[PDB]
Amino acid sequence: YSYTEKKRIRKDFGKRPQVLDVPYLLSIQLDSFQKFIEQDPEGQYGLEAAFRSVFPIQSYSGNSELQYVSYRLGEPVFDVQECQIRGVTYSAPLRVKLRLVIYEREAPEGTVKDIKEQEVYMGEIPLMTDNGTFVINGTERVIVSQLHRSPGVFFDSDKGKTHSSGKVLYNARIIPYRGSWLDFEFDPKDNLFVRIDRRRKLPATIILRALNYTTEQILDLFFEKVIFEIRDNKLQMELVPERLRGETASFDIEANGKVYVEKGRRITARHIRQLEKDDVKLIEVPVEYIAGKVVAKDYIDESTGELICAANMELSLDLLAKLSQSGHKRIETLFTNDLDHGPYISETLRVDPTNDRLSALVEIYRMMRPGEPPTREAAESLFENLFFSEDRYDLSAVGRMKFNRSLLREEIEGSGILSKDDIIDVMKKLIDIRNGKGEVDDIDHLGNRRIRSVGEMAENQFRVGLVRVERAVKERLSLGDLDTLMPQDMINAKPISAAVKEFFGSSQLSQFMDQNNPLSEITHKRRISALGPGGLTRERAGFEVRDVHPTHYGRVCPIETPEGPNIGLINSLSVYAQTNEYGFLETPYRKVTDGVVTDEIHYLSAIEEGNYVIAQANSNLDEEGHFVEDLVTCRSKGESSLFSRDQVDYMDVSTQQVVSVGASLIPFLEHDDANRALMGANMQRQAVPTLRADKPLVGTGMERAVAVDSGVTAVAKRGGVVQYVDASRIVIKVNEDEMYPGEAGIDIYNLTKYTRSNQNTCINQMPCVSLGEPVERGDVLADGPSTDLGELALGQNMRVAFMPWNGYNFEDSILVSERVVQEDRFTTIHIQELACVSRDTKLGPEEITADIPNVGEAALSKLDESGIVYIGAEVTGGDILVGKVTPKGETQLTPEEKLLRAIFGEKASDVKDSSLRVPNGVSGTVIDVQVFTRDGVEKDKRALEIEEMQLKQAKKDLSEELQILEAGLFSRIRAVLVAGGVEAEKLDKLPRDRWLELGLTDEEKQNQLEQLAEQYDELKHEFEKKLEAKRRKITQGDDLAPGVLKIVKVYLAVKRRIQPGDKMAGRHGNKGVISKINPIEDMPYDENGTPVDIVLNPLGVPSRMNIGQILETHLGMAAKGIGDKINAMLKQQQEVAKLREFIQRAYDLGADVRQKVDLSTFSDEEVMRLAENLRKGMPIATPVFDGAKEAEIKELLKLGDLPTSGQIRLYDGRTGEQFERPVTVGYMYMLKLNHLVDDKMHARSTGSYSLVTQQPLGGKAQFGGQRFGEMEVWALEAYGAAYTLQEMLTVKSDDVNGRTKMYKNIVDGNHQMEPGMPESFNVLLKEIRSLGINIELED
Amino acid sequence: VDALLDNGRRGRAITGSNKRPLKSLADMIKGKQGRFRQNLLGKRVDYSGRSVITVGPYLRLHQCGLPKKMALELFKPFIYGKLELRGLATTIKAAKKMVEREEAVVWDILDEVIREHPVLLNRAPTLHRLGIQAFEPVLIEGKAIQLHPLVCAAYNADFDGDQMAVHVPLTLEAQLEARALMMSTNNILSPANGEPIIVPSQDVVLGLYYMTRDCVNAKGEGMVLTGPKEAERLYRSGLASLHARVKVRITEYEKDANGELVAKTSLKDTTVGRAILWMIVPKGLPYSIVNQALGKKAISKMLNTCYRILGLKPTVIFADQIMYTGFAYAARSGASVGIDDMVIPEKKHEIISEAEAEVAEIQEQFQSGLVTAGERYNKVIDIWAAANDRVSKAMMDNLQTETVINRDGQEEKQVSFNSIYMMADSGARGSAAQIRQLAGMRGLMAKPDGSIIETPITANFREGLNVLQYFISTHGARKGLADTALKTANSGYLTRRLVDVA
Amino acid sequence: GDDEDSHLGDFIEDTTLELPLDSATTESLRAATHDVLAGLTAREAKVLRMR
Amino acid sequence: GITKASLATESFISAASFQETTRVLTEAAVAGKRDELRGLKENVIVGRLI
RNA sequence: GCAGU
Ligand SMILES: [Mg+2]
């Protein structure tokens, strides 16, 4: 079966056999950054592509060149953990091998004079840890992926949003990856207009004249010509028949045969069929047929050299009789059939003022740089650098692909710059769409919208840095010292490092990691964000980008999204969702070849998802594969309908394909409303890890995937046997099958003990395996925070009853019994670092000392002689943690305290107490103290003590891992030596250091002895190489901020118990604040006396229709009911046959469930270990949308001898009398969310005030003051509370002379105010007067 | 100079050293972050705290629960002055140290200084003037405020994480306005419409509805009682159920034309629970005010009648007593939502099969060209909405009267005691629009643009919604959520414009 | 932290101000000194008020 | 409208406080206006009894 | 920026 998952097997109620296992959930981040940093030979991705994009850098003249050979990534100076402790970025140095090639002065082809190649250093790039996070200035950050608009061309419209006339106005838009936007559009009178960078619009033919097209070439491109070969007969007209489609023929058509349609009729396609079947191509038209027709060619008089008719000029009868004198047989004319063809280009050329290339370039220049006089070689360089220069415009590979795919070209690859035919084809497709021959694009289709991830954004910022360097190198190669300099005298690392640094630290998408539980991390890494640089802004994003498109099915979760202002802008990647090679989300589907649903899987993106018919995952099918129903529900084009079995092309790969990893953990998701499911998926990510992790009795089976794919747990890399288990480490003796030759064969796993998360929780790894037991590859070795035997345990299985209890659960409140506080269920450890920074003031240095002025001697009891607290010291609020004093001067005390000094003689001290104290309300244990001392500052006794502790710990850990590895190497040597020439009773006496030089006869295994001895010697060498480095990193100085002398960081560990106010929740959106902690004897209780742990409200179920929280309860009653039977069989010490029988009955139960747990193969010891793990309730798995039916829940309730209705009779704890109706009692999985009332409660009487305005400061960190804002002032104005309002304005915020008087009056027993003018009004009168305006106060 | 006065008014804004535009003099005084709106019309305020709210159903209408550790900071100068005055501290420095150490005497002082001292409780957004109400604090030991249940509807406050700010009125005028103008006992009518806003709600309404209903063959039916006290005796002794139809001697007073209360004693055909509830009804009200199953509107009408007839001082007592007795008899009810409470009508599958057959015949009428896709779409929509209304009517007809029970052997139907129906019919929580999605079908859903999809969700939440039905429902769920999140910034702006005009 | 409604300017307190507890301490010390110098001979009490 | 009537009050403190501070303040300056603190906002701005 | 109401 397994070994870690037959300790305790979760009974699966899933019924559809899974075809694709859930992928590695963090492969988005890791695959993206791997594509960024790794070496690319062909130069397509990451750093190699960014170097080849810029290099070789040629000089302005061409005498020297700077080319790029290769790059390398250095070794990071500090480990991940050393970067988290020293508060520095975990990065790697970028060592680029450059080459300066210099020629002679006059060379034939650029023949070289010298080549100077060397390894320049340009910046450090932050490395990504093996869990997808970045350690940047010590904090772990996640660069959230971005859903942005794919580069390409997009045709769209406004649906009569303009001119109030119902005329849809179309617009094409070329969006490059990097470059300038290019818009074409139709105005309400069908004139094509162009815009660049969304500035004011030109006529669209101005850009056609910027290209070298003349007017007749423009009309040749955008039209087809009708030709009048004016024969003897009046205007003998050449004709193709289909031009006659759908118009009111007021002229008759006669050509050697019938008069086809009489004058004054509209003609139909059968008339065109008639004209093409009798084969007439040359007809006779009336004379006025040219009146209105627009000429196509520039008709000139060869007699006089004068153009008698310009192109795009409306031919008339007088002008026709004019040019007919010149002897012109053929008259070309633009064929404009209304409602099939447009005058748009001709009526556009009638508007623009330009008639040649230079005038159009000048008009584009006046559009672009207005008020600057345009010259020829300035305008004709501006236009050529807008769209057609490969360094100022990039329609990238995905942009070129989408561009060619829109215009229906055959190639997917091309150039990154625009061309003549690209712009012509965009205008042509826009005109086609205007003529009804196409349809506008959907801008929020997930095939018009793509994923830009950490490894692409980082490459973009690195390329920005490289071009900031390229400009400087071009400014440097234009000098005359080119014969003495090396390429590292030209490269400033600060541009590159500053670009990469600001992206990784201070971007909108590089976010402080949400580290509450494993789920918070694993769903912050799978985050998609429409916001960010190059995306939307949450204030200007409409209702339509925030919607659930039909193309999010399988690519983006519909449920998991925020609830505030950015909803639908922050999305969560669904479970099986993947990215294309271009960044388009694709999702897997099983091919259905002939009705047999093949287990072959194909990842379809959103554009190719609509060509097919795709069956549901809920579609029934036999073992053969055919759909047993005959009308399968499928998705054809974005709409859903029933199809025959033969039409179906693909099928969903799973039922949790559509929901994210956060919403796939909600059991019975199919019974909750989508609002409540959204709230539950958002509130699971806020649960804090409790002391002892408790698995869900009702889960969905995704617990193990979420707990393993997040790096919170310790997973065995190679299988083996646990050689040594300990709360701080696990030592695994690897199996002989899995160890390489020349290797100790021992894996050591050092566990994270009691460290601070980003959200001040405790992350702490507990060993799961026992000593000597066998482990496999992939088995969870040590739990993490919120992890129970490798499953994801975000909360505790509290026994709930749904009944109203005396109003204490009114309006979503939670009644909690005292046995939840007794049993320490939702007690959570929280770790806070507090920093005491001894700085260098200008009056002198602040010192960390224990002789603090005017403080008690009992307050300094917990400080050591160096002024710092002891480790293990139980501190409460106000206690001094780090004793510090700042030197002060210029006292200038008032005469009364001067006399007070004269009488008693206590002379004031020159120093001020600035020590670090525990914040009020916080009470915990000091668990760590770090002292960072600036180099040159002498270390106090505590810093030297901490350093000797660190050196002893480093030396002891390195020596212990060397002892472990060398013991494994010697065990392997002993195993090899007894494989042939066995000295097993001679080798036990020979000491271990003598076994290397023991020559064995060399059949083959002497090569093994060579490699093991070499491994041992290099292990001994590496131990010293690591120990000296650890010693020099410990005893070295710290690179602190300038001005600070030392920093003492005290790590408090608080234990927050549950209390009224703490927000608790379930997985189904049923949040609630604890309103009372009720005694055990006050709770309702069943006929056996078991009281109820938590009493929830029935009224919170039916209106917000989260029925899942009922079924989870009814099934959690069933699960625990199984456990309460196994526990009973474990108390009577029943034989293992009866336990095996009952556990097999509990695992066999269900209607054609997909799992088979056969306990016939379990040994009796494995059955007993399983039954001991199941005595607290059998964990049940209800997968999302194929989970447990209500009939199966009732069958499980019958198995555990429970009432199948899920409802028992309770009795009141206080009065002992039975509640009149049966109450729903069961086991709901409750979560303690991170909104704790300890961190919410805050109050001030007075305190620090603001600087410019004298109002109180902001928040509970700055001691607060509540904003009595504008709506509350209207509330006090709606009552007649004029004095309450006045004292809220004057003597509580701003009346500086008035609030001190108010305090002294409240103290002297006189509740009276003397309000003056608020200081903000004086600030306002002084700020209006600093404008040229005289505002006054009259009297 | 023009960038100093108004940056960005003429052309390009000057940006310095962060590539962010410099804040000019005109930007200091204008906008949502200018002096006028951010520092002069509303401002941060001393003597103000904030915490999470919890129920505290034991309170009277004028009381809040204030944490001792919040009230010790909000009232610090009051405690300093009372320590100086009572001789317990020789100085204000000594009193400060005593409050800092939290001696046992500063808690007695703190009980003294808050005695008749109101505090204002405020839940932002303060949409109307009942979003700030005064309360007398009762010192509790928690860290969360205990907000009386009856005022929650005024604040729009549920206890799912809401926080509220507490402000201390310092002066005698401020205390007397908190007591006379803003106290929650003065605020029992709404200023928008004259209707009660201190009004019972989900648990209270459900308790009073369960108590005031009648059952057909209930325990203790038919006896004759000497009054409400004997009815309470029988119920507490377990000699009669709260719904037993019974005959109670009721004395009721009516305000005569002169203005005093004249009595009348009559045997009323009642139930035991209405007799019990009569004990809390003040005197000038008639017996017809409780002799009915009391839903939310009947209770609101009870309170409005008491306010018009008797006045404010009897009405606050009646409101607190109504809350206590509703909570009590909802606790005794054991009213619980199970999964069998959502009874699906057994006609749902055949109604849905009939509608599927009908849309198949309209589909073959479309395949045979008799109807265009527009009228086909409309007819399929109407014969799905007819099926939805049929399923809802069959569900509610099954759900409202499933209680058939025996009176002297003869079966007899009565109103259902189903918990889902008892909550909906009370008006406690929910309407038939949600019961229809629990036990009926949840019908036609719309696309993101508003065009309703031609095939409905033929499932409910008691059964499952499959992957496609659930995705189709998320279409409209997120639209509702985005409109909720984006129309508060429009209604607040309308309210602001109206306030500044009027 | 890219939070527009907040700025660096409204976390900076005015340190030059005097705490109203210290204002009350100063006025109480004035009162106490005035009484305990009223408990003396006017000559020497004025010598102390004058010195 | 409620905006065009809020901005057209005879009290420039209320109108400048409402919105379009710049237009209101320039109109009030070149008009040499006077505001007698008669409504509620002008007495909340200056810290008086309403 | 990210959450809570
Ligand atoms: Mg709330």
Coil/strand/helix, residue A271: helix
Q: Which of B33, B77, B91 sits opposite C28 (nearest CB)?
A: B91
Extract the tokens encoding A945: 């003590």
CB A1011 within 8 A of CB A741: yes
Interchain contact, B144 vs A1320, CB within 8 Å: no
Question: Vertex B106, ends B102 and B108: CA angle to 5°?
Answer: 135
Q: Is the CB of A814 under 7 A from strand E?
A: no
Buried b (16+ CB within 10 A) or exposed e, A975-994: ebbeeeeeeeeebeeeeeee
The separation between CA A1270 and the C-alpha centre of its own chain, rounded to angstroms, equals 36
Tell me how long chain C is. Answer: 51
The sign of the dihedral angle between the CA atoms of A56, A60, A65, A66 is: negative
Which residue in A246, A248, A288, A283 sits closest to A268, CA to CA?
A246
The radius of gyration of chain D from alpha carbons, rounded to an integer in Å, stands at: 11
Nearest to D50 among A1277, A1321, A1328 (CB): A1277
Q: Are A653 and A601 in contact (CB under 8 A)?
A: yes
Question: Which of C11, C20, C48 comes nearest A1300 by C-beta?
Answer: C20
Distance CA A836, CA A855 (A): 18
Phi first, then psi: what are they for A151, rounded to 5°? Answer: -70, 145
Please check whether residue A1195 is in contact with residue A1115, taking contact to mean a CB–CB distance below 8 angstroms.
Answer: no
Q: In the 3-class helix/strand/coil scheme, how is B73-142 assigned residue by residue? A: HHCHHHHHHHHHHCCCCCCHHHHHHHHHHCCHHHHHHHHHHCCCCCEEEECCCCCCHHHEEEEEEEEECC
DSSP state of D35: -
- Contact A732/A716 with Cβ under 8 angstroms? yes
Distance CA A1165, CA A133 (A): 42
Amino acid at B37: R
Q: How far does residue B156's CA lie from ligand 1's centre (Å)?
A: 8
Give residue numbers, 1 to 51 of C, with CB < 7 Å from strand E. Answer: 1-3
The answer to whether the CB of A32 falls within 8 A of the CB of A1171 is no
Distance from the Cα of A658 to chain B's closest Cα (Å) equals 7
Torsion sign over Cα A947, A953, A955, A958:
negative
Amino acid identity, position A1154: R
CA–CA separation, A792 and A1231 (whole Å): 12
Buried b (16+ CB within 10 A) or exposed e, A816-833: bbbbbbeeebbbbbbbee
Residue whose C-alpha is closest to residue A816's, from A794, A799, A795: A799
Nucleotides of E strand lying within 7 Å of any protein CB atom = 1-5
Residue A604: closest CA among A673, A653, A643: A653
Q: State the DSSP code for A573.
A: B
Q: Order of strands across the sheet with B261-271? A: B224-225, B245-255, B261-271
What is the distance between the alpha carbons of residues A194 and A1258, in angstroms, rounded to a whole number? Answer: 50
The number of beta carbons lying within 10 Å of the beta carbon of residue B359 is: 18
Residues 1067-1086, chain A, CB closer than 7 Å to nucleic strand E? 1071
Nearest nt to B164, CA vs C1'? E5
Tokens of B213: 């209903």
Pick the CATH number of A828-946+1046-1056 from 3.40.50.300, 2.30.30.760, 2.40.50.150, 2.40.30.10: 2.40.50.150
From A130, D45, A759, select the one nearest B40 (Cα to Cα): D45
Contacts of B77 in chain C (CB under 8 A): 24
Q: On the CB side of A746, how many CA atoms lie within 13 Å of its CA? A: 23
Among candidates A340, A349, A36, which has minimal Cα distance to A220? A349
Cα distance from N-terminal residue to C-terminal residue, chain A: 93
Q: How far apart are CA A1234 and CA A519, in angstroms?
A: 14
Distance from the alpha carbon of residue B157 to the mean position of ligand 1, in angstroms = 6
C-alpha to C-alpha distances, B273 to A1299, B236, B287, B296, B399, nearest whole angstrom: 57, 11, 13, 17, 24
Q: Give the best residue of A651, A678, A1271, A1299 to mutate against chain B (max B CB count within 10 A).
A: A1271
Give the nucleotide with minimal C1' distance to the Cα of A537.
E1
Experimental method: cryo-EM
Token pair 């509702």 in the structure block, residue: B480
Biggest CA–CA distance in chain C, Å, is: 67
Locate the chain A residue with the closest alpha carbon to C24. Answer: A1304
Percent helix, percent strand, percent coil in chain B, to nearest 5: 45, 15, 35
Contact A233, A380 (CB under 8 A): no
Q: Where are the alpha helices (DSSP H) in A561-631?
A: none
A582 min Cα distance to partner chain B (Å) = 27
Q: Give, in order, the Cα–Cα distances in Å from A921 to each of A9, A863, A875, A877, A1239.
A: 44, 20, 11, 5, 9
Residue A878: left (phi > 0), alpha (psi -120 to 50), or beta?
left
Residue nearest to nucleotide E5 (CA to C1'): B162
Structure tokens at A182: 């290019």
Per CB-CB distance under 8 Å, the chain A contacts of B114 are none
Measured CA to CA, the distance from residue A425 to residue A419 in angstroms comes to 10
Give the span between the Cα atoms of A21 and A170, in whole angstroms: 46
- Which residues of chain D make contact with B37, given a CB cutoff of 8 A? 17
Could you tell me if A278 and A254 are in contact, meaning their C-beta atoms sit under 8 angstroms apart?
A: no
Q: Round to whole Å and give the CA distance between A1327 and A1094.
A: 58
| CA–CA separation, B120 and B164 (whole Å) | 10
CA distance A781 to A722: 9
Contact D45, D17 (CB under 8 A): yes
Helix (H) or strand (E) holding C50: helix C42-50
Q: Smallest Cα–Cα separation from A1316: which of A1290, A1282, A1292, A1293? A: A1290
In this complex, how many residue pairs, one in chain A and one in chain D, have their CB atoms less than 8 Å apart?
Answer: 34
DSSP B181: I
Cis peptide before B314 (omega within 30 of 0): no
Phi, psi of A513 (to 5 degrees): -70, 135
Torsion angles phi and psi, residue A477, rounded to 5:
-75, -5
Query: How far is residue A857 from each of residues A437, A850, A941, A1188, measured CA to CA in Å?
Result: 90, 10, 21, 66
Distance CA B154, CA A265 (A): 73
Q: Find chain C residues with C-beta within 8 A of A1299's C-beta.
A: 20
- Residue A1274 to residue A1286: CA distance in whole angstroms: 13
Q: Shortest CA distance to A707 belongs to which of A693, A728, A691, A686?
A: A693
Q: For A545, what's the count of Cα atoms within 13 Å in the CB-facing half-sphere?
A: 20
| DSSP character string of A452-469 | E-HHHHHHHHHHHHHHHH
Residue A1106, CA distances (Å) to A519, A676, B191, B458 in order: 22, 6, 35, 18
CA distance A1163 to A743: 34
* Beta-carbon separation of B500 and D16 below 8 A: no
Determine how many CB atoms are found less than 10 A away from the CB of residue A107. Answer: 12
Q: Residue A1211 pairs with which residues in a beta bridge?
A: A1085, A1218
Strand order through the sheet with A911-913: A847-848, A884-887, A911-913
Strands (E) across B365-490 are located at 404-407, 410-413
Question: Measuring CA to CA, which residue among A666, A677, A662, A676 is closest to residue A700?
Answer: A666
CA–centroid distance, B147 to ligand 1, in Å, is: 13
| Cα separation, A1123 vs A1180, whole angstroms | 11
Q: What is the 3-state secondary structure (H, E, C) of A471-503?
A: HHHHHHCCCCCCCCCCHHHCCCHHHHHHHHHHH
- The rounded Cα B463 to chain-centroid distance in angstroms is 29
Residue B96, min C-alpha distance to chain C (Å): 9
**Contact criterion met (CB < 8 Å) for A1285 and D50:** yes
Q: Do residues A585 and A613 lie in contact, with contact meaning Cβ atoms separated by under 8 Å?
A: no
How many other CB atoms are there within 10 angstroms of residue A884's CB atom? 25
- Residue A512 contacts strand E, CB under 7 A: yes
How crowded is residue A890: how many other Cβ atoms within 10 Å of its Cβ?
Answer: 5
Residue B228: is the preceding peptide bond cis (ω within 30°)? no
Extract the tokens encoding A754. Answer: 């009691």
Rounded Cα distance between A442 and A307, Å, is 48
Secondary structure letter of residue A289 according to DSSP: G
Tokens encoding A1195? 């069958």
Separation between Cα atoms, residue A779 and residue A769, nearest integer Å: 9
Q: Choose from A1277, A1279, A1314, A1329 for mutation: most chain D CBs within 10 A.
A: A1277
Tell me the sheet residues that pair with A91: A126
Among the listed residues A888, A913, A891, A893, the one whose alpha carbon sits nearest the alpha carbon of residue C29 = A893
Q: Which of A12, A1, A169, A226 lies closest to A1192 in space, CA to CA? A: A12
Specify the 3-state DSSP secondary structure of A805. Answer: coil
Resolution of this entry, Å = 2.7
Please check whether residue A1315 is in contact with residue D44, taking contact to mean a CB–CB distance below 8 angstroms.
no
Q: What crossing angle do the helices spanning A1164-1173 and A1136-1148 adopt, rounded to 10°? A: 60
Q: Phi, psi at residue B342, to the nearest 5°?
A: -85, 80
Which nucleotide comes closest to B156 if you measure CA to C1'? E5
Triad B285, B291, B292: Cα angle to 5°? 125
A510: nearest nucleotide, CA–C1' criterion: E1
Give the pairing of strands B63-67 and B132-140: parallel
On the CB side of A750, CA atoms within 13 Å amount to 5
CB contact under 8 A, B33 and C21: no
- Give the 3-state DSSP-derived string for A652-676, with helices as H, strands as E and coil as C: ECCCCCCCECCHHHCCCHHHCCHHH
Residue pair A2/A779 in contact (Cβ under 8 Å)? The answer is yes
**What's the token pair of residue A1102?**
């039916």
The shortest CB-CB distance from D47 to any of A1290, A1328, A1333 is to A1290
- Residue B45 backbone dihedrals phi, psi, to 5 degrees: -140, 135
